[PDB]
Write a protein that binds this ligand. Structure first.
Ligand SMILES: CCCCCCCCCCCC(=O)OC[C@H](COP(=O)(O)OCC[N+](C)(C)C)OC(=O)CCCCCCCCCCC
Ligand SMILES: CCCCCCCCCCCC(=O)OC[C@H](COP(=O)(O)OCC[N+](C)(C)C)OC(=O)CCCCCCCCCCC
Ligand SMILES: CCCCCCCCCCCC(=O)OC[C@H](COP(=O)(O)OCC[N+](C)(C)C)OC(=O)CCCCCCCCCCC
Ligand SMILES: CCCCCCCCCCCC(=O)OC[C@H](COP(=O)(O)OCC[N+](C)(C)C)OC(=O)CCCCCCCCCCC
Ligand SMILES: CCCCCCCCCCCC(=O)OC[C@H](COP(=O)(O)OCC[N+](C)(C)C)OC(=O)CCCCCCCCCCC
Ligand SMILES: CCCCCCCCCCCC(=O)OC[C@H](COP(=O)(O)OCC[N+](C)(C)C)OC(=O)CCCCCCCCCCC
Ligand SMILES: CCCCCCCCCCCC(=O)OC[C@H](COP(=O)(O)OCC[N+](C)(C)C)OC(=O)CCCCCCCCCCC
Ligand SMILES: CCCCCCCCCCCC(=O)OC[C@H](COP(=O)(O)OCC[N+](C)(C)C)OC(=O)CCCCCCCCCCC
Ligand SMILES: CCCCCCCCCC(=O)OC[C@H](COP(=O)(O)OCC[N+](C)(C)C)OC(=O)CCCCCCCCC
Ligand SMILES: CCCCCCCCCC(=O)OC[C@H](COP(=O)(O)OCC[N+](C)(C)C)OC(=O)CCCCCCCCC
Ligand SMILES: CCCCCCCCCC(=O)OC[C@H](COP(=O)(O)OCC[N+](C)(C)C)OC(=O)CCCCCCCCC
Ligand SMILES: CCCCCCCCCC(=O)OC[C@H](COP(=O)(O)OCC[N+](C)(C)C)OC(=O)CCCCCCCCC
Ligand SMILES: CCCCCC(=O)OC[C@H](COP(=O)(O)OCC[N+](C)(C)C)OC(=O)CCCCC
Ligand SMILES: CCCCCC(=O)OC[C@H](COP(=O)(O)OCC[N+](C)(C)C)OC(=O)CCCCC
Ligand SMILES: CCCCCC(=O)OC[C@H](COP(=O)(O)OCC[N+](C)(C)C)OC(=O)CCCCC
Ligand SMILES: CCCCCC(=O)OC[C@H](COP(=O)(O)OCC[N+](C)(C)C)OC(=O)CCCCC
Ligand SMILES: CCCCCCCCCC
Ligand SMILES: CCCCCCCCCC
Ligand SMILES: [Cu+2]
Ligand SMILES: [Cu+2]
Ligand SMILES: [Cu+2]
Ligand SMILES: [Cu+2]
Ligand SMILES: [Cu+2]
Lengths: 382, 236, 241, 123, 51, 236, 52
């Protein structure tokens, strides 16, 4: 819900999310929904964004309407920040547990230490039930099971109320007598030395000694109880395992790319060379969370968000099968209302008019090839 | 008569209006207020911004102009009892200023932290921002200016000169509003992380310090209270 | 003027209550702005309440307003609760926002978004000022105590959140699991300025070293802000602006 | 000149130096970019230059070689992930206006000092 | 590298996406001069009025 | 007589000398002046540096010594008409100082930017530098010191004490010349990019600010002008 | 490995071995872009003749 405002070229060339899947579209309270997919770190990472040396796999959502039970990059849990390598493809998996009823737009996002949020596609997930039924149990290494919704809440309230009461008692003790104007007049007109006299000093000594003694006793008691404590666990985690993708058998060279101002379409001319031994066909163009599909070649079945999905938004001038070894140049047009709804047309406002995306090529048997394209995007006005 | 029930209204108007504002932002925070380019955002928060800015400008102009036009020309022939009554009215103005300062610089500022700490900010005019900078700040600025003008135009102690502590207390917290430019500039450009303790925030802190001039302002009001009707009793 | 001695007393009492309201809530606004924009992120999150950065920063930036308000209130009225009133106002504003916005507007649990405790430090600062009225002695000893007692004062609250948990193959504290589970879309984990370990971290010294550094810097900041408050008390009449 | 005229007129009217520092400096900061827009607007016409999109000013900087001034030294807007919508110029203008208020306030007193007519008896 | 000729013969034409061809040697020079002279004249008029 | 034609010479000498210097650097900027290790660089710019440094030292010594030796011992028995004439001569000195300050701190400083922004600087003594720091700066320093000495030795107002604004106006711009050390140190080491707005340049800016003491200096000269021959007319 | 365990004054002792830089280098430690092969010892009780 935080994208459509970021720069179009920055959304195009940071991170490409694909193979996204959602386990469920509608859940009950305490029910789990799992989000899977892959993201590729673009080679032409913008210089204004710091390299993803420190990155965190986050969830885009309006507060804890879900709780993040687990999150994985590769196959290993990532509760801390992680290091990503430019040009690598990683697979991710986020497990969410429903907490608050309603209709929520859930995004998978990557926060980069020096570049800000990179928001992936968002999907509407319905939560039904009552928040009062939500439980977040956890078992500690000390052998006790607690609910994270209310654990330590009573202790926190008690201690804060106790110390607030001590401070209020001090202030009220001094506030029983007249406060401002008579004391000001006494201090000004001659030496005061009358508004602070025993047993006021004795009361202050008692307050100070009691404060120190209570702090020490409370610390000792909180050490006898909970004798086993550990510090906060933090630190960027290295050695994220990237996907070992096979080398693509399709090479694509972008010969100019244009978009009409104003308009809802993007046009580019591609020289596609088919290696390997199977006839390929262009089935998809993904630019920034928007999938332009050639419906005659490929159809989406993973429940991709409709406002981000162009079922027939990809038109190829000659999308006949491309025989192996054969090279041809075609005009590819990606047109959909999403191009203007998600403000991908506002790249005219950007200080770097370059686009990047993913082309998905499909053969007859159905196996697909992913190739990455990037080129300057030239607006056309007449 | 002396202190009258204008203090009750001073507390209640801010309390009720800001409770309604909190209800409004609780209802329209999500669901017309998350997406800054949705049409419903324009009808529920951009319209709110426009209406509140126009109403704040009109109210500030009317209030300040009325206070300045009804200024007491013959301050010399003011009885001590009337001076005491005017001092109490000025204290009511200061109470209203303190209440508005609380609502602006604590409640809506920190609630703002929560907002940003929970969502991806989509614009310089988040539904909540509209509430803090374009309401929790102009309202307290208007109240502070009105209190300063009332002191200058009704209290002989605060007449015949501009009180430095009062001017600081009134203008420093006002400088937080133009400081929003530094907030925006150093959110989009400088600093991309949502950290409340980032240096892009020291402009709010520096001018929040100037509210400490309330100490000199209040000792000045104490002296103004204790001019003719200082007692006796006190120091007797 | 005033009719009699009794009416003067009643007028003074009414002025006392109204001026206490004004002082308290102007301090609440200004002090809360300063605190939340100088220590707010650590104060917001239990998984930010660490032993190095939280313990270091919070007393240093929070001793500011108590020093100034003390330098005014004690000097002009012999009222030894400037630090206490500052800390109480900050705690009131923080708790109101935590309950009605952090937990009210958003639905973060209170055990996740509770603020830190500061009353022990405030009480030390106020009593050390009233006894031995020396402002220098206060800045040296009371600010030392204010810095040193911060972490022990908050330990009863945060200690239960530091119980170790075996969470999906990784060791995590309860506060760590809270930060992991309750998603902060705008606050990724790397923003967390917490103790991460160094090659020059010798033994079990992280908390005491941070506490002593905070106490020394608190001495310095108290010394500066005593004179800042001295200036802010000026009753001058700048003839023209 | 537009900013200077605003600063001078706002000072002469309402002789308050504080009012000048607040309002006139605000205007001085805000009117800078609109004042220069008629000059630089023709240089921002887009050009398709050898496969890449470039403004006329970009082509000027590219063509007219500055041996001592490589392109990376250029501190210009490059885009951020927190740049929301079409806000770059107004946000910068308002930040400049606020900082102009601050700098004007400081330099009023700096000039007050520089006016001193004191006779430092010995150096 | 030896260059022969006259600097006056140099041209730097460029065609914009708006369909106009301009010479980068002197494009916008007149507009820049005009606006700068206009604002300088306004300031000088203010100063002379007070002078 | 009063104001005589020494003002015309004061303007013309700087104008002509600096026009010739500009012609010289236009002729020998390229082509004996690009390569700092070429033999022609030594004959056209290193020799220029040596000659200009020697001539500046000699001229400063002679001028300052003459002004100090011809100082007026009997300032008390100075008629108001002679005081007015000496005030006009001091104003001519200040005009020469302002002209030299312009030529040094604006023309040759900014032209310098161009030089560096266009070529790869080869040494601490670029043909153009030689012009700015070793001419556009010593010349205005000499003029400022001479004006200060003339004021102190001929004007009773500027006698009996060292005027703080005049001392600042005279010495601060002088401090730019030793600041060249920071320029060099922070060009070769610190900061390798040719950026005119780099912090290695704040020493020139800080001491350029001290030229604002001309305001206090000029109100002092106005008072010195209006001592005996203040009028009447003015304020009458 | 250590060439000798007990040496005379002016006698040479050689220390050899291998070190592997761990892939999971902690983020709190800067990457070993600038590293120095040093000897841990209580002052110059030995002099470092050579290091490779
Ligand atoms: C110092 C001077 C301050 C000046 C600024 C004041 C700002 C006022 C609010 C702006 C509203 C806006 O701009 O929005 C207009 C809103 C948009 O809601 P709607 O879509 O019509 O839904 C129906 C309306 N509900 C959602 C509120 C039910 O509707 C309105 O007409 C209602 C606005 C009521 C404001 C007055 C009540 C305040 C509480 C009572 C104690 C005072
Ligand atoms: C009443 C007077 C008598 C008491 C005197 C107390 C002397 C010190 C006690 C050390 C406790 C301990 O145990 O050592 C220190 C404990 C940790 O201990 P460890 O983990 O075992 O450290 C392993 C290494 N050792 C075995 C050598 C200790 O924490 C600390 O690092 C505290 C460090 C504080 C640094 C800043 C101090 C500034 C002082 C300013 C004074 C105005
Ligand atoms: C005027 C002076 C008043 C001083 C009041 C002291 C009250 C008692 C504190 C016990 C602390 C403790 O138990 O040990 C140190 C622990 C930190 O331990 P950790 O290793 O980080 O592990 C954390 C987990 N625990 C608690 C299960 C082990 O707490 C602190 O960070 C406090 C550091 C400041 C100590 C100040 C006393 C030293 C002398 C001061 C005067 C120069
Ligand atoms: C002029 C100033 C004089 C002050 C004298 C010191 C009074 C100490 C009171 C007891 C504190 C205590 O016992 O607790 C301090 C704890 C010890 O922590 P620990 O050892 O890690 O573990 C907990 C072990 N217990 C449970 C056995 C305590 O926190 C610290 O690490 C702080 C220790 C550093 C103290 C530095 C003092 C330097 C004084 C220099 C004088 C010239
Ligand atoms: C006479 C009184 C009534 C007028 C009140 C004006 C209210 C604001 C108008 C916004 C115009 C607009 O259109 O929005 C803002 C336009 C861009 O618009 P966009 O590209 O559509 O932004 C897309 C997102 N949206 C649809 C939600 C707008 O620029 C800006 O980001 C300006 C940002 C300025 C930040 C600093 C302001 C400091 C103020 C200090 C006060 C003392
Ligand atoms: C005392 C107050 C005086 C204010 C005078 C304003 C004159 C009109 C300016 C129109 C600007 C425009 O047209 O829109 C904004 C544009 C930038 O647009 P951009 O999106 O970056 O694109 C650039 C390309 N253009 C021009 C083809 C779209 O210019 C600016 O950067 C000006 C920003 C400051 C505006 C100040 C007015 C808001 C209220 C100020 C009081 C709080
Ligand atoms: C106390 C201060 C009160 C000031 C009230 C505002 C007066 C605005 C005058 C019209 C300006 C205009 O219309 O132009 C401003 C342009 C709009 O730019 P745009 O929307 O991007 O595109 C151009 C669209 N046009 C061609 C339709 C204009 O520049 C800006 O983005 C600046 C907008 C931010 C204004 C912030 C004001 C905050 C006030 C808070 C009061 C409590
Ligand atoms: C405040 C006290 C300032 C003191 C410093 C003054 C510096 C003077 C210049 C240094 C020259 C140098 O050093 O170089 C010596 C130059 C090197 O040129 P050349 O190879 O002989 O070619 C032939 C000469 N042309 C190229 C000039 C034609 O030749 C000369 O003899 C000529 C120097 C003439 C300087 C006097 C004229 C100035 C303009 C008229 C108004 C005053
Ligand atoms: C050389 C430095 C060593 C430390 C001394 C610094 C204290 C100096 C403070 C000062 O200037 O004097 C203020 C008061 C004066 O009160 P007196 O009327 O002198 O009271 C004397 C009786 N008494 C011992 C109970 C205090 O006297 C006091 O401040 C209190 C004196 C008692 C010392 C303990 C008080 C501090 C408690 C934490
Ligand atoms: C962020 C920093 C904190 C701000 C505190 C700085 C205050 C500086 C003191 C000051 O303002 O001096 C006022 C003089 C004008 O003097 P006058 O108006 O002649 O008043 C006569 C008495 N007096 C000279 C002692 C003032 O100088 C003037 O020209 C008037 C300017 C007054 C502006 C002060 C308002 C500050 C609000 C932010
Ligand atoms: C509470 C803050 C709200 C804004 C008010 C700040 C202005 C204060 C300036 C000040 O101290 O007074 C200086 C002059 C005094 O001139 P007066 O002789 O009072 O003239 C009154 C008639 N007039 C309305 C045409 C001005 O009066 C003026 O400065 C001009 C007053 C007219 C307001 C508009 C002037 C500014 C134009 C941009
Ligand atoms: C970059 C910072 C800007 C520079 C502005 C700083 C000016 C500081 C004021 C100052 O210089 O004080 C002079 C006193 C010597 O006093 P005296 O020569 O006894 O003069 C009697 C009258 N007076 C005491 C008020 C000066 O102190 C002395 O010992 C004489 C030193 C005078 C040096 C001032 C010249 C500054 C030129 C850069
Ligand atoms: C001193 C500041 C008091 C702030 C209290 C506040 O924010 O109240 C809103 C919150 C809203 O939660 P709730 O009471 O459950 O009502 C929800 C209504 N909305 C969502 C519109 C806020 O609770 C109340 O309205 C209690 C009334 C307190 C009167 C001083
Ligand atoms: C009064 C203390 C001010 C200290 C300033 C500070 O903490 O700045 C951190 C920042 C370091 O940037 P970093 O924290 O790495 O920011 C990471 C996020 N990005 C890269 C988007 C800015 O440094 C600067 O850019 C210069 C600040 C000048 C202050 C007048
Ligand atoms: C108020 C500062 C005036 C600076 C003018 C200047 O630098 O002039 C040099 C420039 C040189 O260009 P140009 O006139 O074509 O003659 C070239 C001769 N060289 C190359 C030696 C400069 O033009 C002139 O000589 C015009 C005379 C203006 C008299 C105030
Ligand atoms: C009054 C503002 C001063 C701000 C200083 C500044 O901008 O420094 C930038 C520079 C950052 O270096 P950078 O701009 O990356 O320089 C790139 C070119 N090299 C690496 C050759 C220096 O930081 C420093 O080295 C410390 C400056 C101390 C100032 C007292
Ligand atoms: C950094 C603290 C400086 C506080 C300024 C106080 C000045 C008082 C002058 C009366
Ligand atoms: C940073 C601005 C400080 C200016 C110094 C002015 C001092 C005036 C003393 C007479
Ligand atoms: Cu969304
Ligand atoms: Cu990619
Ligand atoms: Cu901010
Ligand atoms: Cu330089
Ligand atoms: Cu290893």
């Amino acid at each position: 819900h935080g994208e459509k405002s970021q720069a179009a070229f920055m959304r195009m060339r940071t991170i490409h999310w694909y193979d996204l899947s959602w386990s469920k579209e509608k859940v009950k309270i305490n029910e789990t929904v799992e989000i899977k997919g892959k993201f590729h770190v673009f080679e032409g990472w913008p210089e204004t964004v710091d390299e993803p040396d420190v990155a965190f796999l986050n969830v885009g959502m309006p507060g804890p309407v879900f709780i993040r039970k687990e999150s994985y990059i590769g196959g290993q849990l990532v509760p801390r920040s992680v290091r990503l390598e430019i040009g690598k493809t990683y697979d991710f998996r986020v497990v969410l547990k429903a907490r608050r009823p309603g209709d929520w737009h859930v995004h998978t996002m990557m926060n980069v230490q020096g570049g800000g949020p990179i928001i992936g596609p968002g999907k509407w997930i319905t939560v039904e039930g009552s928040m009062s039924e939500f439980r977040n149990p956890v078992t500690t290494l000390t052998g006790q099971t607690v609910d994270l919704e209310n654990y330590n809440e009573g202790n926190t309230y008690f201690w804060h109320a106790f110390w607030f009461a001590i401070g209020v008692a001090w202030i009220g003790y001094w506030s029983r007598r007249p406060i401002f104007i008579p004391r000001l007049l006494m201090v000004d007109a001659g030496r005061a030395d009358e508004l602070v006299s025993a047993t006021d000093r004795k009361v202050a000594m008692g307050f100070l000694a009691a404060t120190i003694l209570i702090v020490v006793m409370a610390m000792s008691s909180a050490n006898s109880k909970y004798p086993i404590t550990i510090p906060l666990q933090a630190g960027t985690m290295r050695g994220m395992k990237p996907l070992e993708l096979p080398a693509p058998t399709v090479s694509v060279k972008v010969e100019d790319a244009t978009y009409r101002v104003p308009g809802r379409a993007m046009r580019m001319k591609l020289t596609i060379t088919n290696h390997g031994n199977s006839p390929i066909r262009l089935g998809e163009f993904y630019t920034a969370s928007v999938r332009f599909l050639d419906s005659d070649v490929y159809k989406d079945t993973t429940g991709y968000p409709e406002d981000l999905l162009a079922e027939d938004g990809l038109s190829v001038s000659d999308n006949s099968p491309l025989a192996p070894g054969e090279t041809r140049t075609v005009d590819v047009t990606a047109s959909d209302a999403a191009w203007e709804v998600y403000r991908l047309s506002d790249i005219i406002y950007d200080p770097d008019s370059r686009f990047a995306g993913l082309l998905f090529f499909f053969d007859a048997t159905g196996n697909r090839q992913v190739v990455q394209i990037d080129a300057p995007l030239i607006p056309s006005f007449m | 008569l002396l202190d009258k029930k204008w203090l009750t209204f001073a507390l209640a108007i801010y309390t009720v209006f800001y409770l309604w504002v909190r209800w409004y932002e609780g209802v329209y925070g999500w669901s017309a207020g998350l997406d800054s380019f949705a049409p419903e955002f324009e009808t529920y928060w951009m319209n709110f911004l426009y209406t509140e800015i126009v109403l704040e400008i009109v109210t500030a102009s009317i209030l300040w102009g009325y206070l300045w036009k009804t200024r007491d020309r013959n301050l010399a022939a003011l009885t001590p009892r009337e001076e005491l009554r005017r001092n109490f009215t000025h204290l009511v103005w200061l109470v209203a200023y303190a209440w508005a300062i609380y609502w602006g610089a604590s409640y809506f500022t920190e609630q703002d932290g929560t907002w940003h700490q929970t969502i991806v900010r989509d614009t310089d005019f988040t539904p909540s921002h509209i509430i803090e900078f374009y309401l929790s700040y102009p309202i307290y600025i208007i109240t502070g200016f009105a209190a300063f003008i009332y002191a200058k135009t009704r209290l002989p102690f605060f007449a015949k000169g501009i009180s430095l502590p009062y001017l600081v207390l009134v203008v420093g917290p006002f400088m937080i509003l133009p400081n929003v430019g530094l907030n925006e500039w150093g959110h989009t450009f400088w600093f991309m992380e949502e950290l409340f303790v980032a240096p892009l925030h020291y402009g709010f802190v520096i001018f929040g310090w100037l509210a400490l001039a309330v100490m000199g302002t209040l000792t000045q009001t104490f002296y103004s209270f204790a001019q003719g009707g200082l007692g006796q009793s006190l120091c007797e | 003027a005033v009719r009699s001695h009794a009416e003067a007393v009643q007028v003074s009492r009414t002025i006392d209550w109204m001026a206490l309201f004004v002082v308290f809530f102007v301090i609440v606004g200004s002090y809360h702005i300063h605190a939340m924009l100088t220590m707010g992120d650590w104060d917001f999150w239990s998984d930010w309440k660490d032993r190095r950065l939280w313990v270091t920063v919070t007393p240093i930036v929070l001793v500011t307003f108590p020093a100034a308000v003390q330098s005014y209130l004690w000097e002009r009225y012999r009222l030894p609760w400037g630090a206490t009133v500052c800390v109480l106002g900050l705690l009131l504003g923080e708790w109101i926002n935590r309950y009605f916005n952090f937990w009210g507007w958003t639905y973060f649990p209170i055990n996740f978004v509770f603020p830190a405790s500061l009353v022990p430090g405030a009480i030390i600062l106020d009593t050390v000022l009233m006894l031995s009225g020396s402002y220098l002695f206060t800045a040296i000893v009371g600010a030392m105590g204010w810095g040193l007692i911060f972490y022990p004062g908050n330990w009863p609250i945060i200690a239960p959140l530091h119980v170790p948990v075996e969470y999906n193959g990784m060791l995590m504290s309860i506060a760590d699991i809270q930060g992991y589970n309750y998603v902060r879309t705008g606050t990724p984990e790397y923003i967390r300025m917490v103790e991460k370990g160094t090659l020059r971290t010798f033994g079990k010294d992280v908390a005491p070293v941070s506490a002593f550094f905070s106490a020394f810097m608190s001495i310095l900041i108290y010394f500066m802000w005593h004179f800042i408050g001295r200036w802010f008390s000026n009753e001058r009449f700048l003839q023209s602006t």
